[model samples]
Target chain A: SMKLFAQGTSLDLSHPHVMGILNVTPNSLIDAVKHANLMINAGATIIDVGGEEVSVEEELQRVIPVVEAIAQRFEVWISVDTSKPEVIRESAKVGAHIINDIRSLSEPGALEAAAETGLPVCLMHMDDVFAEVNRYFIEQIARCEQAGIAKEKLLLDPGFGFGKNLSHNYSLLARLAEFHHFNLPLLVGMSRKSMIGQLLNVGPSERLSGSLACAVIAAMQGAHIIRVHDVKETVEAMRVVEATLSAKE
Target chain B: MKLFAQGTSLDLSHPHVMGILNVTNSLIDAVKHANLMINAGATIIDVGGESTRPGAAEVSVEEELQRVIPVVEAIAQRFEVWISVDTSKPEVIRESAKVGAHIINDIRSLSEPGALEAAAETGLPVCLMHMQGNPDDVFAEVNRYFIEQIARCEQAGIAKEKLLLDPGFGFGKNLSHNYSLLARLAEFHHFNLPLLVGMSRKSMIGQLLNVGPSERLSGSLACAVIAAMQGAHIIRVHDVKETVEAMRVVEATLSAK
Candidate 1:
C-alpha cells in the first residue's frame, strides 16, 4: 500500500538527503541554470524540475523537455514537482518516481491520476492567507484521501511559508509533534525559503544556517523527509542535532 | 581595549563583548570545561554559577555566592580575561560587580525586585539579557516570547549599549521552539540592542545530533558559526577559541551586503 512504484523498494531516512531545485521558468525567484553545476556537485540525490513563475497550464508545457533532459543526462531519481494532473502523468511516463503536489491532489482528479500511476506522492498542505489554518489543512487532507492516494505512499507537510506569517509559521513549527498523530511520514520543505530569510534578515543565498536549523527541528519531530538546499551543511547540522536529541548514545 | 570594565583603563571607545564559561563538576568526560574555553580566545569570562544540566537547582544567593565568588576571583587573578558574573541574585550582583568583577550579566534583565536597584546604584558595566520566564518554568512557554522581555528591558532605563538580547534557546524551549527563535532573532534588533546568543553545548545540539553532552563540540561550534553569521554582537560560548576560529571562517566565507 506504500506509494512507491516498486512495492519492494524503500527510501532511507537519514542525514544528508538532498532535494535539488530546477526551475524551468526565467521568472522563478531562483534561476535553475545558474545553480545547475553547484546543485549536482553538492550531493543532490533528486532534481526537482518545474516551471513555477508561470501559470500551471503554461508551466506544464515548459517542463516536459527539461524533465526529459534530466532523465537522459542524470543518474539520480527525478521528481515531478507540480500540481497539474497532466504534468504528473506526463512526468511519470517519462521516468519520474516521486510526485510532489503542493495543492495536495485537490485539483479535481489529480488523486486518481496519481493513484493510477502507482508512484510515491508527497502530499503538502496549503493554507489560505485570507482563511483559517485548521480548516485549510483538514480540507486538503480529505481531498488527498478522496483522490485515492495510498497512506504509506503519502508524506504530509504542514506548509511553513506558503501562506504563513512569522507567528503562524512558528506556531506550526513549535507543535510539529501534533502532525505525527496523522500516521503519515512528514516531508518538510522550507529550504532557503522566505521564512528563514525573514528570521535571519539575510537574502535567500545566506539562509543556509536557518535552513540547517530547520532541518534539525524537522528531523527531531519525526519528519521522514526534509527537502533542502546546501545539502552538505544540512547533513552536518543533522549530525549535531541528532547528537543533542539522543544524548545517551 | 574593551568596555567590560568602568572607571579604569578600558578603551570604552568601543564596546566590550563578554563571553560565557559554564563549568560542570560531574565526573563524566570533563575535558571541554571552562578552563579549555579560556585558552581559546575568550576576553571577558562570564561564569555561570548554576548548573544548566536540565532540572538543575535554582540556587539561593548564599549557595550561588559560595559556588561562584571563588571561581570569579581565581579567573580574574590568573588570566587577563575580565571576570563577569552571570547571576540574578542582588546579593551576588552587588558583591561580584563591586569586587574585582568588571561586568554584571543578569539573565533576568534586572527586573527581579532588588536587581535593578543594584545595577542603577553600582553603575558598573551591566548586561541586561532577554530570558522568557524565571528559572523554574521558562521553557514551558516558548511561543512568541521575546516581545515582552525586550519591552521590559527598554522600559527599565537600560541603555541600548548596556543591553544584550539573547533569544534564550534552551532556557525554556523545545527544539522547534528554539529554532523558531533562532529563525527570528533579527526581529529583536528593533530594540536597538546588541544580540547575545548562548547556545554552546546547549541541549538543542545534543538532542538534534543524538549525541551526549560529551560529544557536542562540533555541534556547539556549528551553532557559534551560525550565530556569528546572524550578526550576533556576542556569542556566550563554552569553547571560546574554537568559537573564534569558527566565527573567523564564517565571517570570511558568509559575508553579507
Candidate 2:
C-alpha cells in the first residue's frame, strides 16, 4: 500500500480519497469556506481551491484567505489549484498542502516556486496528445526533480476533458491503471464534464448518477484520489467500491 | 439472456432492474410512480401493500389484495413491463396473477400453507427467499431451506425453471448475517435458478452506514453494484434511475472488449 505523507499528515493510498472542488471567485470566499466545511463534514479528504482565468494577484487574493480559513479550522489538507508560482508560494504560507497545476509547471517559476514550498504537487496532462501522456509525465517528473523537488512529493492527474474529446477521455479512463507504473498516486476529476454530458445527453445538474458511475469505475481501476463536486454521494460510492474490493474470497 | 417465466421470457444475460412500487399510497400515486420507474429504466415493478420493514405493522389479506391488485392491474394496463406481487398470502398470489401480475416474490419462501400450490397454479416464476432462526450456521440453514422449498415446488408441479432464489436480505437476519450472505451471494448459484436480491433502503444498509431510509441511496447503490457484480439477475431497488446508472457502468466495465 502506498502512503502519501505531506507536511506531517499521512494518508493511506490503499483506498481512494475524495478531493472536493472549491472554486474561489472573489465574491464567493465566504460561501467557499462554508462549502469546504460542508465537504469536510461529508468526508472530503482534501479541499481543493482554484480560481478560473484569474491573474496572479487575483488568484492569491481569492485563494489565500480561503486556504487560511479552512486550514485554520479543519484538519483536512488544503490543495491550491494554480499554475502561478506566486499563488502557490502565498497559499503555502497560509498552510496549503498540495499544489495542483493543470499547466504541469510549464509556467516560468511554477516549478521552482512549488519546490521552494516543499508541498506535494499534482502534475496534470492538458495538451492535445493521446499517446504521449506517459512520456509527458516522465519529462515533467524529471523537470520537477531538476528543480529541486523530490520524486516522492508528486501526484499525477490525466486531466480528463481538459483537452481531450469524449472518445479520448474514455480511452484514457479505460486505461487509467497503466499510469500506476509510475509508482505515484493518481487523481481523477470528471464530474459534470462534457465526457459524461455528451455521452448521456444530460445537463450538469442531472449528471450525479453518471458521475458516480465514472467515479466507481475510476476507483475500481486503482485511482488514488477522486475529485468531484458531489462529495457525500461520491463518498458513498467509494465505500461501495471499498466494500466490494475488500470482501473475502 | 434467458429468464424462465411462464409464457413470458426476458433477457437476463445483462442484469435486469426491478423497481419497487409500494402500494401504500393512492392508486393514482401508484400509477404515477410506476410510470416514473419504468421511464427510469426499470424492467419490472414489484408491488407490495404491506410494509416488510422491521417492526412494520402487518396488513390483512383483504387489505393487501385491495392495496396491490388495483395498482397491479392499472400498471399492467398502462405499461409494457412485468409486474411482481410481493406477498406471502395464497389468495393475494392467485388474485394478483388474475389481475396480470407476472411474478411472485414471497418473503416467507412459500412456507405459508398452500403457498406452493397457489404459486404453482399461477404458472408465474416464484422467488423463494430464505429467512428464519438464528445466525448459527445460517448459510447451511439457507441452503437447507432452499433445497426443501425446491422439493416442495417440484412436488407441487412447479418446474424448477419457474423458480428464482432470493437470499432474503434483512428478513430475519442480523447485520452480520445479511453481509455474510451478501459476501457469499454467488454460493447460492449452485441452485441454478435466477437470483433476485432486494437490499435497497433496508435495515442492512441503514445499520451499516448509520443513516435513515431517505439517506440510504448511496449505500443502496453500493449494494446494487456488489450484487450485480456477483451475478445477481434481478436487482430490486427503490431508486431505479440511480441503480440503472450504476449498473450501466458495471455492465460496461464487465463487458469491455
Candidate 3:
C-alpha cells in the first residue's frame, strides 16, 4: 500500500510528516532567505516551491533558480507546483522530485509528461473551470493507472482553499479521510488559508492559532504531509502530537 | 482578578513583567535609569548593581552598594513599581531595602553569609536563581544545576511565598543544557515556588540561531514564549515589549481557548 517513487524512496502513511513551504514570491510570510534553515530547523523532509500563485510560465521563470539554490543547500525532496509543461520540465531538469498540478493532469499532454519524467506526481482535483469542486480522487487514480503510470507515481490532494469558497473548503477537510480509500499518501495544503480567516474573522497576521488548529485536525484525519506556512511552530506542535499518538503503555 | 501590591502600587497578578537593568558605577544617575525602565512599562524593575553573570568582573561589596543604592533610593522616592535589588552582595540587601527596594533578586541563591538575615530583616520578597558552579565556570556547568541552587535557596530561611525560583536557562547552560531546561521546564513545579526564567539576549539563543548578539531578538522572544508555555510565572528580559508580545500569543493559546 506504500506509494513508491524514485529508485528507492517511498512516502509512508503510518505517521504524518511535514512538507516545508518555500515560495519564490518575495512577499511570502517567512521569506525565501531562510528557506533552507527553516526546513532544517523544522526537520521537514520536503520543500514545495511555487511563484506567487502565478501561471506555469511565471513559475518557470521564478522557481528554477531558487530550486537550484535550495538543492545546493539541502538534500531533501523538492516538489514544484506548476501546471505548465515548460516549468514542470525545467523543475525536473534541475532536480525537482515531484510535480504538483492543480489541473490533476486533466489538461492535454499533462499526463504523458508526468509519466515520461518518472517523478511522482500530485494530482489535485478542482472544479472544471478551476472554480467547481469535484470528487475526482478515484477518477484521477484510474486515469493515472490507465496511462501506464505506476501506482507509486501518484498522490491525491483535495485542494483545500485552492479554488473553493468557505463551505466547499471545509467540506473537503470534513471528508479528508474518505480520500484514503485509494490507499495512497494524502497531502493537505491549507496553511494560513481563507477557511481559517473566514472562520476566525482574523487577518493573515492573526490566523496562526486557527490555522494550526485546522492543521492538527488534518493530521488526526490521517494526512501524511501537511503544507504549512508557520513551519517552525507547526513542526514543534506536531512533534508533541506524534509523541502522544505513538506513546505506548 | 488582578493582584496589586498593597504597600506600593505595583501590579503582580495577571502575569507580571520585569526588565533586567545592569548598572556600572561610571553611570551615576541610577535613579534616572530606573525611572526610564519604570516609565517604559516595566512592572518590576530588576537592579543589578554588581555583575554576577558568568565571566563578568566581580565587584567588592562597597562598590556593589555604590553602584546599586542610589538607583534603588531614587526610584523608591518617586514611582510605585516594585524595586527588586538584583545582587548577591549581603550588604546591599538591607541598604537597598532602606532605599525602597521591595524584593531581593539574588543570582547567587544568598549562599553567602549575612544575606539571609538581611532579607529577613527587610521582609522583602526573594528571587533565588539556579546556576551550576561559580560565575567563572557558569558556561561549563549544567548537570544537576537547578537542584543544587534551589536547595541552597530553601536552606537560606526564605519563606515559601517570599521565594521565586529561576532555572538559570543561560547562566550555566550550553546549547544542549538549555534545550533540556526547555523540555523539562514544567519539572520545576515540584519546587512549588513561582518560577522566574531570565533568558533575555543570552548565548543560548545566539548559538541556536547561529546569529550574533544584535540578531538574537527573535530567538530570545521564541524562548520567552516557550518558557511561558512551560508555566514560568515570570520572565526577566531586556526587550520587554517584544517579550510581552510573544508571551501574549502563548497566553492566548493556553487560557480558555
- lDDT at A152, model 1: 62
Model 3 ranges with Cα > 4 A deviation: A1-48, A53-76, A82-94, A98-249, B1-17, B25-42, B76-80, B134-157, B206-212
- For model 3, which pairs clash? A127-A132
Q: What are the per-residue Cα lDDT tens digits for candidate 3 across A133-211?
A: 3346666778888988877777778887665776566656655676677777788887777766665555888766555
Cα RMSD to native, each candidate? Answer: 13.0, 3.7, 8.9
Q: Give lDDT tens digits, candidate 2, residues A142-210.
A: 999998999999999889887687666776776788888999999999888887777567789988877
The predicted structure with the larger lDDT, 1 or 3, is 3
Q: Which residue runs of candidate 2 sit more than 4 Å off their true CA positions?
A: A127-151, A167-183, A220-222, A239-249, B4-6, B59-62, B133-160, B183-193, B229-231, B248-257
What DockQ does each prediction reach against the true complex? Answer: 0.06, 0.30, 0.09
**lDDT tens per residue, model 3, B1-257:** 11222255433333555877777644456666666666655778888843666777878888887778877776767877777878776789888888788778887777678877777667677877666654323322432565555555556665566677776777656766666666566667776767778877787766655667786554565556556656777788887655554444344334412
Tell me the chain A TM-score of model 1. Answer: 0.79
The candidates, ranked best first by lDDT, are 2, 3, 1
Against the hidden reference, what TM-scores do the models get?
A: 0.52, 0.85, 0.61
How far does residue B237 in candidate 2 sit from its true spot (Å)? 2.1
Worst 10 residues of 3 chain A by lDDT: A240-249
Residue runs of model 1 more than 4 Å from their true location after superposition: A1-9, A14-16, A27-37, A53-58, A73-75, A127-139, A243-249, B1-235, B238-257
